[PDB]
Specification:
part of a larger assembly; 9 chains; A mainly alpha (86); B mainly alpha (172); C mainly alpha (122); D little secondary structure (12); E mainly alpha (128); F mainly alpha (606); G mainly alpha (156); H mainly alpha (127); I mainly alpha (459); B: 172 residues; 6 helices; 52% helix; flat; I: 459 residues; mainly alpha; binds ligand EHZ; binds myristic acid
C-alpha cells in the first residue's frame, strides 16, 4: 500500500461530497454541517458516511458515524484513524 | 447512555444497507434498491406518539435482522475481517524502548533524545493533569467516561499519554 | 445402464450377475471350444516383473510396449503401433468378456423362459 | 521516508 | 421479519430480536445510568494507573483474583454434601471406572479364551 | 545405481543447508530469501536427474544406512524408499515450492520476519520430503507431525491474529484426530506383523488388514480434509495469502493421500475399506463444492475446491487407481497452486481484499493474471490435452467403468459440474463485469517476480499432463471397448454447470429482487457444520471439565473421600479424648472400670 | 490491600449480604445474582450472563481488547471456554434448532442414498477377466508343491 | 452532536501531540548510525568488479555467485554423501537393495552375453 | 559409586564455608563436574548389572536416572539464583545443603542393593523437600502443602515397610539380585493379595495415581521453583524405579489386581488431561500435566511387557527434562508478573522472542514431536498396551489428543496475542534463566540422536 497521505484523503472526500448530487458543488463547504449548513436528514447522513465507507475502504464505527458532522472533521477523523502526519 | 429512538434506527439502517449492497453486489443494482428502501424508510417518517414508533421499530428491526447476508461483506479491517487485528503481532508498547541496551539507544540517538523530552513532557503533564482531573471531576466520581479538557493555562489534555503514544496503526 | 434397468427395475435373473456369472459350461453349446491361448510365457511375465492385473492375455503386447518405450528414450512421441496392438487386444478381450456377458445373458434368457415354457405346458 | 520500528532489545 | 430465530445457549438472542431492545421501560433505560457511572470510575482508576508514569509493574485485577480464588479456594467452603452433588459424584465417580473395568475385562476374557487352544493370529508376533 | 539414489540423498540434504546456515547465525538475513530461492531452485535442478534413469530403466530401491534402534527383533534405521511415487513427486514438489515462494518474495515482503518466514517454508519442505521419502511409518510420522506443527506456526504467522490462532488450533486438532488411525496402524503392524518398514509389511501378506486399513483410512481422512475432518483446510486460509499457496494449498493436504497410495498393496484387499474412501471422498466433492458455489470469497472457494479435489484422487484409490491418483495429485498440485498466487496477486494488487463482491472489471486491468486464472479455472476441469484431461476425465470414466455403488458415480458427475460452475463464477466476479473497488486505481501487476513465478506455472499447468502421461507407463488395464457416453459425460457435465452459472452470473445484472434462499445460507455457513461442531460438542466437553472433572471429581470428591474425612475423624474425636475436665473422682472411676473389666469380663487372667 | 469482605464469601442468603457481595464484586444490588445453591461450591460468585467474548462489542474501549475485557469490572466464572478463541455464544442468522435439524437430516440422508446405492451396485455389462495360468495360481501366491485346479478358459 | 466544547479542543490537543509524536516517530537522517562491518578485504576485491558497469563485469559475478553457490552448497555435498554411502553404507549387507530390472525375453544380459529367448509371433491384430 | 558419593557429600563442607558471594559459582561448577563423572555410568554390559560393591549396584535402569539427578542439580542452582538473592548467607547455604542432601539421597536410592536400604533413602528424600516446600515457599497454603505431600507419601510408605521386613523373614534376604534370582511364584492366597498390595500403593501414591494424586497439584504448583523441578523431574519417578524392582517377585499376581488400578489410571490421564485444558493457574497445568504423563507409565510398568518397560524408562527420563522446563518456564513469567494466572500475561511473543521459542519446543516435547524420546517412550507403551488389548488404543490416543489440545493452549494464552499495555516490567530476558532453558533442551535432542542409552536394561 502506497503512503496514502491526508491530502489525497481530503481531496477524495470533498470531491465525493461535491459528487454527491444532493450536496451541490457550490453549496459544499469544508465545514459542511449536513443538518445545518447542508440541511440533509438523518438517513442522508448515513448515506454520506457510508459513501466514503466504500470510497475510502476503511471502517467507521457507528458510534463515530453519527457524531461525524463536517467534511473538515471527516478529514480529521480519517486523519486520526490511520494517524497521518506527512 | 440509552440509545435514543432515532439513534437506534440509524444503527439498524446502517448495516441494513450494507446488507443490501452485500445482496445486490452490483453498484447500480444496489443504488436502485438503496433508494427504494430509502423511500420505504421515509414511508412513515412521521410518528407522533412514541408508542407507534416502538411498534414501527419492532417491524423495522425484525426486517434488517433477517436482512443480513448469509456471508455479509466484512471488510478486511472490519471486526472479523481478513486484515483485522492482523498486525497486532508487530506493535510493541512504548515503554519497551526504555528496556533497550545502551548500544541500541546510542545507535538511535536522535529518536531517544526526542523520546526523552517526550518522557519529560509526560512528567509535568501528568502532574498538572491529575491535579486538573481531580477537581474537574464533580462529586460522585465521573458520571461518564468522557474526560475533561485542558481548559486551564499552559496545560496538556489530562490522560493523554497512552492516547498520544498509542501504537501507530501501521507499526510495520 | 440398460442391463442395470433390466435387473434392478426388471428381472435380476434375466441379467448376468457380474460377481457370479458365467453359470454354464463354456464347452456346452460350443462343441470343441478352442482355449484362449497364451502368447507370453510365465517367465515372460515373471522376468518383466509385470503387475498381476496387467498380467492378462494382453500382457504379451504390453511387454512390447515397454521395450520400445524403454528404448524410445529420449523420445516419447514414438511407440504408437505398440499400443495399437495392445489396446486392440484389450478392445477385443473386453469384447470377449462382453460376449461372455451376453452369452450368459442369453444363457439366462433362454433357459428361464424355456423352464417357463415347461411351467406353461404342465 | 522511514518511520521508527519498535522491538525488544535483542542484544541480550 | 420472518419466522423468528429461536435463541440458544451457544447462540443467544441477538441485540435486535431481544424484547428489551424495543421494550425500553423508564426504569430499564434508567438502569443504564449508574452501571455506566461505576464503569466510568472503574475506567478512570485504570487510566489513573495505566497512564500513570510513576506506576510500574502490574496492577492487581480484582476480578481476576476473585475468579482464581473462587475457582481454586472457595469451592470446598461453599461445598455441600447435597444429594444431587453426591449423585453426580457417583455417576462420574465409580461409574466410568466400572464402565472401563467391564469393557476391558470383557475384552480380556473374550481375547484370552482363544489363546489357550490356538485360535488367534500370532504367528508373526515375537515381540512384546 | 551410482546416480539416482545418491542424487536423492544430495537433494534432501541441500535443502537443510539453509536451515543449518540460518541456525548458525552466520548467514545474512537480508538476502536469505533470495538465498532461499537459489537453494530451492537448485534443489529442484538436482531433482530432475533422479527422473532420468527412472525413465530409462525404471530402477527403484530403498536406502537404509545408519541403524538407529536394534529393539531386539525390530531394527530401526532412517530409510527412504524411492519408488515411482516418490521419485517423480520430488521434482513436482520442488518446482511448486520454488515458484510459490518466488511469488511470495514480492508478495510477502511487508513484514519484519520475512527471513523467519521463508525459513518456515524451508522447515516445511524437509518435513514433507521426509514424509514422501520414507520407508517406515515412523519417518512418515515424523513428517506427518512436522508439517502439522509447521502449519500451526505458519497459519498463525501473525501471533496477534486471533482467527489464525483458532485456525492453527483447529489445524493440528483435526490432524491429531487423523494420527489416531496412524497410531492404530502403528500398533497393529508392530504387533500382528511385527514390522515398521514399508517393504516387510506389504510382503508379509497381511490378508486381514481390516483394522489397519481403517487406521490407514482414518489417518488419510484427517490429513486430506475428509468430511468430519474437513473444516481446518478452509480455516488454514486465514493466514497470509502465500501461506494459503503453501502446505494447505496442495502440498500438505495430499500427504495422507500419499499414504493411501503407499499402502495400496494391502489397500485393495478389503472391498469394505476400499468402499468407505470413495464414499467420504464423494461427499467432500459434493459438500465442499456446494459451499463454494454460493460463497463470498476467493481463497476459501478454491480451498473448498481443493478439498473437493482432495476427495477426488482417493475416490480413485477407493476404486483401486493408485498411480492414476498420484498423477492427478501432481496435476492437481500444478493448477490448484497456479490459481492460488494468481488470486494472491489479485489480493495484493487490490489492497488485501478477499471477497468476490468487491472484484470486477479486472480483465483488461489485470492482463497476465486474467489469462492465468482463466486457464486454471477450467484447467481444474481439464479440457482435452491438459493436466486435468489425463487425470479428471480418466478418473470419471474409471469409476464409471468399474464396480461401485449407485451413488458413487453420481457424486463424481455432480463434482465435475459443481466445481466448474463456481470455477466460472470466480472469473465473473473477478475480471468480468465492473470494478466494484475503491476509486483509487492502484491495480497493478508489473512486478517481474510476480510474472516469472506464475509464468513457469503456465507451462506447468498446461504441458505437464501430456508429457508425464507419455512418460509414465500405464499401470492398469486400459479401458478400450467402452459404451461411449460415460466418457463424453465427463466433458459435458462441465458445461451446463458453466452454462447455468453463466446465466446465474447474468441474473446478478438483472434488477430482479433476490430472496434469502435456504440454499444460499446453507452453502454460506459451510452447511452449518462449523456452526455446531465448533459450538456444541466443544462447549459440552469444555464445560463438563470444570463443573464436573476438575471440581466435582477431583476438587470436591477425591479430597473428601480420603484426606478430609480421615482428617475430620481425627479432628472430631481428638476433642473427646482431650476435653477432660480434670476431676480426680472421674479419672479414678475410669481406673476402677478398667481394672474390673481387665479380668472376669475380658478374662485377661484366663 | 486484600481482606475477607472483598474476598469471595460463602453462599449469600440474607439480602444485606447480597448487597455486601454486590459492592465487593463491583455490580449494583440488582445486578448481583449468585449461582444456584445445589452444593456445587459456587457460593457468592454471581451467575453472570451466559455469553462469550465474541459477543462483546469491539468498538468499546476495552482495557484488554485482546480478549475484550475491562479492568475492575466483574468477569464470568466460566470465562475460559467463553473467550474469543474458544467456544462462542454469538447469535447465528439461522435458528439453532433449524440448522441442527438441517445437519441431523443431511448426514442421515447422505448415508441413506449411499446405503441404497450399496444395495444397487452399478457395473458395466461386461464379463470377468479370467486371467491366464489358473488366474495366476503360483504368481498370486499359490502352493508350489501341489498342482492347481486349472482355471483354463476357452475362447468365445 | 458533532462534538462539545470539552471534546473539540480535547481532540485538537491530543491530535497535535500525536502529530508531533508521529514526527518524532520518524527516522532522522542520521538514524540509523551503524558500526563498522568487520570483513577481510577479500570479498571487496571481487565486488568492485561488479560495480565497473560493463555487461561482463556484473553478470559474471552473478554467475560467479551461482558458482560459489554450487561448490559450497551442492558440489562439496555430492562428495561427502558419495564418500558416505559407497564406502561405509555399501560396506554393510542389504543397506542398499536395488530391484531387478525388467529383463526382456529378446534382450540380452550385459555380463553373461546371454540373449533371453523371445516369444513367438504375436496375434498382430492390426486395427 | 562412592566415586560419585564421596564428591557429592564433599560439596557440603565446600558450600558451607565458601565466601558470601562464591556459593553460587562454586556449587554450580563442581556439581557440573559431578555430572560429567556420573556420565561414565552410562556404560552397561549385556545383562549384568554393574556390581561395584556389596551395598551398591547399578544397571541400565539406575544410571539414566542417576545422570538425570546429577545433571539436574546445577539447574535448580541457577534457577534459584533469581529469588534467593534477597536472603542472608547462612540461610542461603542452608538452601544449598538441602539440594545437595536431596541429590545425595537420590544417588544412594538408585544405587541401593536391597529393598530396605533402597526404602530408607527413598523416603529420606521427604525431609529435604519438606523444608524446601514449607520454609522457602511463597504463600499461606504452603503449610497445608507440606502436610498433604508428607502424609500422602507416608500413608503408603509404612505398609511397604511391614511387607519388606516380612520378606526378610520368609525369603531370607531382601537383596534385589537374590530376590530376582531366587524369584518364586506368589500364590493367590488372600493374605498374598495384601502382600502384593502393601508393596504397591507406596510406589503409586507418589507416582502419582489417579485419585491418590491430590498432593501433586497441592505441592508442585506451590513449592519453590527449585523444589518444583526435582519433585516433578525425579521424585515422581522414584515410584517407577521401585516398581520395576518390586515386580520381580510379585508374580503372577499382577494379572488380577492390576485391573483396579489399570482402568483407574486408564480413565485417569484422560480425566487429568481434561483438567489441564481447563486450568486458571500456570503451574497448575504442568503439575496436572505431570500426573497425566505419569499415568501412561503406570500402565507401562503394570502390564509387565519388555516393550512397555523400555517405553516406561524413555517416558520417565523425557518427562523429567520436559516438566522441569515448563516449571522453569512458568517461574520465569511468574517472577516478572508476580502471579501465575494463565490469561494474566497472554501475548508475550512480541516482547519475548527467545522465550517464545523456549515455549515452543518445550510444549512440542510435551506434544511429543517425532522423534523425541517422549514418543519413543509413549509409542512403546501403545504397542505393549495394544498387544494386551486392542480397545486400549482409543483411550490414551484420545488423551494424547487432549494432551495436544492444552499443550498449545498456554502457548496461545501466554505468547500469542497482544501484550497487556499496563504491564511495563517485562525487562530484557536475563541470560541466567535463558541459558537455563538451553541446558534443559539440548540434552533432549542429544539423547534423541542416540536414545539406545535410556531404554533401561531390557534393551
Ligand atoms: C438487505 C436488508 C433487507 C432488510 C432490511 C430492510 C430495511 C429495514 C427497514 C425497512 C423500512 C422501515 O420502515 C424503516 C424504519 O426503521 S421504520 C420505524 C422507525 N421510525 C419510526 O417509527 C418513525 C420515526 N422517525 C424517525 O425515526 C426518522 O424520521 C427517520 C430516522 C426514520 C428518518 O430520518 P430523520 O432525519 O430522523
Ligand atoms: C448424456 C451423458 C451420458 C448419460 C448420463 C451419464 C451416464 C453414466 C453411465 C451410466 C450409468 C453407470 C452404469 C453404466 O455404465
Amino acid at each position: 500500500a502506497p503512503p496514502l497521505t491526508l491530502e489525497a484523503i481530503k481531496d477524495r472526500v470533498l470531491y465525493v461530497l461535491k459528487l454527491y448530487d444532493k450536496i451541490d458543488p457550490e453549496k459544499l463547504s469544508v465545514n459542511s454541517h449536513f443538518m445545518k449548513d447542508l440541511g440533509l436528514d438523518s438517513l442522508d447522513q448515513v448515506e454520506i458516511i457510508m459513501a466514503m465507507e466504500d470510497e475510502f475502504g476503511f471502517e467507521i464505527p457507528d458510534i463515530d458515524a453519527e457524531k461525524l458532522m463536517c467534511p473538515q472533521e471527516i478529514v480529521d477523523y480519517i486523519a486520526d484513524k490511520k494517524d497521518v502526519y506527512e | 447512555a440509552y440509545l435514543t429512538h432515532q439513534q437506534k434506527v440509524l444503527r439498524l439502517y446502517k448495516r441494513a444497507l450494507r446488507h443490501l449492497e452485500s445482496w445486490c453486489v452490483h453498484r447500480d443494482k444496489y443504488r436502485y434498491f438503496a433508494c427504494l428502501m430509502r423511500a420505504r424508510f421515509d414511508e412513515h417518517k412521521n410518528e407522533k406518539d412514541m408508542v407507534k414508533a416502538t411498534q414501527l421499530l419492532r417491524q423495522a428491526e425484525e426486517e434488517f435482522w433477517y436482512g443480513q447476508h448469509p456471508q455479509p461483506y466484512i471488510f478486511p479491517e472490519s471486526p472479523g475481517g481478513t486484515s483485522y487485528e492482523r498486525y497486532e503481532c508487530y506493535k510493541v508498547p512504548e515503554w519497551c524502548l526504555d528496556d533497550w541496551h545502551p548500544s541500541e539507544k546510542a545507535m538511535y540517538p536522535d529518536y531517544f533524545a526526542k523520546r526523552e523530552q517526550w518522557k519529560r513532557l509526560r512528567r509535568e503533564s501528568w502532574e498538572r493533569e491529575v491535579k486538573q482531573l481531580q477537581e474537574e471531576t464533580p462529586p460522585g466520581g465521573p458520571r461518564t467516561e468522557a474526560l475533561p479538557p485542558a481548559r486551564k493555562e499552559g496545560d496538556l489534555p489530562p490522560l493523554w499519554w497512552h492516547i498520544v503514544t498509542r501504537p501507530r496503526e501501521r507499526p510495520m | 445402464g440398460a442391463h442395470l434397468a433390466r435387473r434392478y427395475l426388471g428381472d435380476a435373473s434375466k441379467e448376468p450377475d457380474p460377481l457370479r456369472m458365467p453359470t454354464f459350461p463354456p464347452d456346452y453349446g460350443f462343441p470343441e471350444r478352442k482355449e484362449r491361448e497364451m502368447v507370453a510365457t510365465q517367465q515372460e511375465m515373471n522376468d518383466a516383473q509385470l503387475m498381476l492385473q496387467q498380467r492378462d492375455y494382453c500382457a504379451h503386447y504390453l511387454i512390447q510396449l515397454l521395450k520400445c518405450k524403454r528404448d524410445s528414450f529420449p523420445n516419447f512421441l514414438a511407440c504408437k503401433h505398440e499400443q495399437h496392438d495392445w489396446d486392440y487386444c484389450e478392445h477385443l478381450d473386453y469384447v470377449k468378456r462382453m460376449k461372455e456377458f451376453e452369452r450368459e445373458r442369453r444363457l439366462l434368457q433362454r433357459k428361464k423362459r424355456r423352464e417357463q415354457r415347461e411351467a406353461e405346458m404342465a | 521516508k522511514r518511520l521508527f520500528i519498535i522491538k525488544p532489545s535483542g542484544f541480550y | 421479519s420472518f419466522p423468528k430465530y429461536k435463541p440458544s445457549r451457544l447462540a443467544t438472542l441477538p441485540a435486535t430480536l431481544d424484547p428489551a431492545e424495543y421494550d425500553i421501560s423508564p426504569e430499564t433505560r434508567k438502569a443504564q445510568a449508574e452501571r455506566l457511572a461505576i464503569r466510568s470510575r472503574l475506567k478512570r482508576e485504570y487510566l489513573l494507573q495505566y497512564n500513570d508514569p510513576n506506576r510500574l509493574g502490574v496492577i492487581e485485577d480484582p476480578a481476576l483474583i476473585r475468579w482464581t480464588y473462587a475457582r481454586s479456594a472457595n469451592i470446598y467452603p461453599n461445598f455441600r454434601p447435597t444429594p444431587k452433588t453426591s449423585l453426580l459424584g457417583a455417576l462420574f465417580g465409580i461409574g466410568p471406572l466400572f464402565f472401563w473395568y467391564y469393557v476391558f475385562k470383557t475384552d480380556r476374557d473374550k481375547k484370552e479364551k482363544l489363546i489357550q487352544e490356538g485360535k488367534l493370529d500370532q504367528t508373526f508376533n515375537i515381540s512384546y | 545405481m551410482n546416480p539416482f539414489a545418491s542424487l536423492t540423498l544430495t537433494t534432501l540434504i541441500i535443502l537443510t543447508i539453509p536451515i543449518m546456515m540460518s541456525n548458525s547465525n552466520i548467514y545474512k538475513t537480508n538476502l536469505y530469501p533470495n538465498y532461499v530461492k537459489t537453494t530451492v531452485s537448485y534443489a529442484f535442478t538436482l531433482s530432475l536427474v533422479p527422473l532420468l534413469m527412472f525413465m530409462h530403466t525404471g530402477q527403484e530401491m530403498i536406502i537404509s544406512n545408519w541403524h538407529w534402534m536394534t529393539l531386539q527383533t525390530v531394527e530401526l534405521s532412517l530409510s527412504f524408499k524411492m519408488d515411482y511415487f516418490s521419485v517423480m513427486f520430488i521434482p513436482v514438489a520442488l518446482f511448486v515450492t520454488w515458484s510459490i515462494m518466488e511469488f511470495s518474495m514480492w508478495y510477502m515482503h511487508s513484514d519484519p520476519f520475512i527471513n523467519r518466514f521463508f525459513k518456515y517454508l524451508v522447515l516445511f519442505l524437509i518435513t514433507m520430503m521426509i514424509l514422501v521419502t520414507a520407508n517406515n511409518l515412523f519417518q512418515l510420522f515424523i513428517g506427518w507431525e512436522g508439517v502439522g506443527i509447521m502449519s500451526f506456526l505458519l497459519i498463525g504467522w501473525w501471533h496477534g491474529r486471533t482467527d489464525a490462532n483458532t485456525a492453527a488450533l483447529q489445524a493440528i486438532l483435526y490432524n491429531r484426530i487423523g494420527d489416531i488411525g496412524f497410531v492404530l496402524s502403528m500398533a497393529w503392524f508392530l504387533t500382528h506383523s511385527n514390522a515398521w518398514d514399508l517393504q516387510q509389511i506389504f510382503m508379509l501378506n497381511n490378508e486381514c488388514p481390516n483394522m489397519p486399513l481403517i487406521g490407514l483410512l482414518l489417518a488419510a481422512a484427517g490429513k486430506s480434509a475428509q468430511f468430519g475432518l474437513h473444516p481446518w483446510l478452509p480455516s488454514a486460509m486465514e493466514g497470509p495469502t502465500p501461506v494459503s499457496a503453501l502446505l494447505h494449498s496442495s502440498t500438505m493436504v495430499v500427504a495422507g493421500v500419499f499414504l493411501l497410495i503407499r499402502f495400496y498393496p494391502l489397500m485393495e484387499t478389503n472391498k469394505l475399506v476400499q468402499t468407505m474412501t470413495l464414499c467420504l471422498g464423494a461427499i467432500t466433492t459434493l459438500f465442499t463444492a456446494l459451499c463454494a458455489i454460493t460463497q463470498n470469497d476467493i481463497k476459501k472457494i478454491v480451498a473448498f475446491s481443493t478439498s473437493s479435489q482432495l476427495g477426488l484422487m482417493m475416490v480413485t484409490i477407493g476404486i483401486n487407481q493408485p498411480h492414476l491418483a498420484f498423477l492427478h495429485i501432481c496435476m492437481h498440485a500444478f493448477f490448484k497452486a497456479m490459481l492460488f498466487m494468481c488470486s494472491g496477486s489479485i489480493i495484493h494488487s487490490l489492497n488485501d481484499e478477499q471477497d468476490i463482491r468487491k472484484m470486477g472489471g479486472l480483465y483488461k486491468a489485470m492482463p497476465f493474471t486474467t489469462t492465468a486464472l482463466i486457464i486454471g479455472s477450467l484447467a481444474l476441469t481439464g479440457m482435452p490435452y491438459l493436466t486435468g484431461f489425463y487425470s479428471k476425465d480418466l478418473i470419471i470414466e474409471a469409476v464409471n467403468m468399474s464396480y461401485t455403488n449407485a451413488w458413487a458415480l453420481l457424486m463424481t458427475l455432480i463434482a465435475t459440474s459443481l466445481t466448474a460452475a463456481y470455477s466460472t463464477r470466480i472469473i465473473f466476479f473477478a475480471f468480468l463485469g465492473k470494478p466494484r473497488f475503491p476509486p483509487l486505481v492502484l491495480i497493478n501487476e508489473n512486478n517481474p517476480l510476480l510474472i516469472n513465478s506464475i509464468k513457469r506455472l503456465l507451462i506447468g499447468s498446461i504441458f505437464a499432463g501430456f508429457i508425464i502421461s507419455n512418460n509414465i507407463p500405464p499401470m492398469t488395464v486400459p479401458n478400450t471397448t467402452m459404451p461411449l457416453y460415460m466418457k463424453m459425460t465427463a466433458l459435458i457435465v462441465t458445461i451446463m454447470g458453466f452454462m447455468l452459472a453463466l446465466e446465474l452470473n447474468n441474473t446478478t445484472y438483472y434488477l430482479k429482487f433476490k430472496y434469502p434462499s435456504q440454499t444460499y445460507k446453507f452453502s454460506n455457513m459451510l452447511g452449518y457444520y462449523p456452526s455446531i461442531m465448533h459450538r456444541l460438542p466443544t462447549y459440552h466437553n469444555l464445560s463438563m471439565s470444570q463443573k464436573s472433572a476438575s471440581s466435582l471429581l477431583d476438587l470436591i470428591w477425591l479430597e473428601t473421600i480420603l484426606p478430609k474425612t480421615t482428617s475430620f475423624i481425627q479432628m472430631k474425636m481428638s476433642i473427646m479424648v482431650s476435653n477432660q475436665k480434670g476431676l480426680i473422682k472421674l479419672y479414678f472411676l475410669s481406673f476402677l472400670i478398667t481394672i474390673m473389666i481387665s479380668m472376669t469380663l475380658f478374662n485377661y487372667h484366663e | 490491600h486484600v481482606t475477607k469482605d472483598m474476598f469471595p464469601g460463602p453462599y449469600p442468603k440474607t439480602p444485606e449480604e447480597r448487597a455486601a457481595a454486590a459492592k465487593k464484586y463491583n455490580m449494583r444490588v440488582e445486578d448481583y445474582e449468585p449461582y444456584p445453591d445445589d452444593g456445587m461450591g459456587y457460593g457468592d460468585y454471581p451467575k453472570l450472563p451466559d455469553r462469550s467474548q465474541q459477543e462483546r462489542d469491539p468498538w468499546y474501549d476495552w482495557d484488554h481488547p485482546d480478549l475484550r475485557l475491562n479492568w475492575g469490572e466483574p468477569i464470568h466464572w466460566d470465562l475460559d471456554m467463553y473467550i474469543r478463541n474458544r467456544v462462542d455464544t454469538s447469535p447465528t442468522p439461522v435458528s439453532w434448532n433449524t440448522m441442527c435439524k438441517h445437519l441431523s437430516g443431511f448426514v442421515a440422508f447422505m448415508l441413506f442414498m449411499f446405503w441404497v446405492g450399496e444395495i444397487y451396485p452399478s457395473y458395466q455389462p461386461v464379463g470377468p477377466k479370467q486371467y491366464p495360468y489358473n488366474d495366476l495360481y503360483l504368481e498370486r501366491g499359490g502352493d508350489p508343491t501341489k498342482e492347481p485346479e486349472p482355471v483354463v478358459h476357452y475362447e468365445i | 452532536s458533532g462534538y462539545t466544547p470539552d471534546e473539540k479542543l480535547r481532540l485538537q490537543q491530543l491530535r497535535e501531540l500525536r502529530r508531533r509524536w508521529l514526527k518524532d516517530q520518524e527516522l532522522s537522517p542520521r538514524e540509523p548510525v551503524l558500526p563498522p562491518r568487520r570483513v577481510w578485504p577479500m570479498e571487496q576485491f571481487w565486488n568492485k568488479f561488479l560495480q565497473d558497469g560493463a555487461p561482463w563485469k556484473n553478470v559474471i559475478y552473478k554467475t560467479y555467485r551461482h558458482s560459489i553457490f554450487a561448490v559450497t552448497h551442492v558440489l562439496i555435498p555430492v562428495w561427502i554423501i558419495h564418500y558416505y554411502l559407497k564406502y561405509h553404507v555399501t560396506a554393510k549387507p542389504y543397506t542398499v537393495v536395488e530391484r531387478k530390472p525388467r529383463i526382456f525375453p529378446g534382450d540380452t544380459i550385459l555380463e553373461t552375453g546371454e540373449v533371453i529367448p523371445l516369444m513367438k509371433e504375436f496375434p498382430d491384430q492390426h486395427h | 559409586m562412592l566415586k560419585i558419593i564421596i564428591p557429592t557429600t564433599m560439596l557440603l563442607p565446600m558450600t558451607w564455608m565458601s565466601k558470601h558471594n562464591m556459593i553460587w559459582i562454586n556449587a554450580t561448577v563442581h556439581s557440573l563436574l559431578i555430572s560429567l563423572i556420573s556420565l561414565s555410568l552410562l556404560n552397561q554390559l549385556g545383562e549384568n548389572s554393574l556390581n561395584f560393591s556389596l551395598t551398591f549396584f547399578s544397571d541400565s535402569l539406575s544410571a539414566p536416572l542417576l545422570v538425570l539427578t546429577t545433571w539436574l542439580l546445577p539447574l535448580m542452582l541457577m534457577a534459584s539464583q533469581s529469588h534467593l538473592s534477597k536472603e542472608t548467607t547462612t540461610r542461603k547455604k542452608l538452601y544449598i545443603t538441602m539440594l545437595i542432601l536431596l541429590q545425595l539421597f537420590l544417588i544412594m536410592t538408585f544405587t541401593a542393593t536391597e529393598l530396605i536400604l533402597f526404602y530408607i533413602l527413598f523416603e529420606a528424600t521427604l525431609v529435604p523437600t519438606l523444608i524446601i516446600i514449607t520454609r522457602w515457599g511463597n504463600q499461606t497454603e504452603r503449610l497445608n502443602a507440606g502436610l498433604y505431600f508428607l502424609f500422602y507419601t507416608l500413608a503408603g510408605s509404612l505398609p511397604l515397610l511391614v511387607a519388606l521386613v516380612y520378606i526378610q523373614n520368609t525369603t531370607g534376604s531382601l537383596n534385589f539380585l537374590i530376590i530376582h534370582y531366587w524369584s518364586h511364584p506368589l500364590s493367590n492366597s488372600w493374605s498374598n493379595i495384601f502382600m502384593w498390595l502393601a508393596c504397591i500403593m507406596a510406589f503409586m501414591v507418589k507416582m502419582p495415581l489417579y485419585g491418590l494424586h491430590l498432593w501433586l497439584p497441592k505441592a508442585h504448583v506451590e513449592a519453590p521453583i527449585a523444589g518444583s523441578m526435582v519433585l516433578a523431574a525425579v521424585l515422581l519417578k522414584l515410584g517407577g524405579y521401585g516398581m520395576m524392582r518390586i515386580t520381580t517377585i510379585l508374580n503372577p499376581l499382577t494379572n488380577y489386581m492390576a485391573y483396579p488400578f489399570l482402568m483407574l489410571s486408564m480413565w485417569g490421564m484422560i480425566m487429568t488431561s481434561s483438567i489441564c485444558l481447563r486450568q486458571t493457574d500456570l503451574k497448575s497445568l504442568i503439575a496436572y500435566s505431570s500426573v497425566s504423563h505419569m499415568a501412561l507409565v503406570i500402565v507401562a510398568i503394570m502390564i509387565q511387557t519388555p516393550w512397555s518397560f523400555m517405553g516406561a524408562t524413555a517416558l520417565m527420563i523425557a518427562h523429567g527434562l520436559t516438566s522441569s522446563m515448563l516449571f522453569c518456564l512458568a517461574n520465569t513469567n511468574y517472577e516478572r508478573v508476580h502471579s501465575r494466572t494463565m490469561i494474566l500475561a497472554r501475548g508475550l511473543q512480541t516482547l519475548l522472542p527467545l522465550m517464545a521459542t523456549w515455549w515452543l519446543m518445550a510444549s512440542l516435547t510435551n506434544l511429543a514431536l517425532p522423534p523425541s524420546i517422549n514418543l519413543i517412550g509413549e509409542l512403546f507403551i501403545i504397542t505393549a498396551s495394544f498387544s494386551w488389548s486392542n480397545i486400549t488404543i482409543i483411550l490414551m490416543g484420545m488423551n494424547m489428543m487432549i494432551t495436544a489440545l492444552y499443550s498449545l493452549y498456554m502457548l496461545i494464552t501466554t505468547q500469542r496475542g497482544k501484550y497487556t499495555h499496563h504491564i511495563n516490567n517485562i525487562k530484557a530476558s536475563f541470560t541466567r534463566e535463558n541459558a537455563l532453558m538451553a541446558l534443559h533442551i539440548l540434552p533432549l535432542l542429544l539423547l534423541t540422536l542416540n536414545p539406545k542409552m535410556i531404554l533401561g536394561p531390557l534393551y
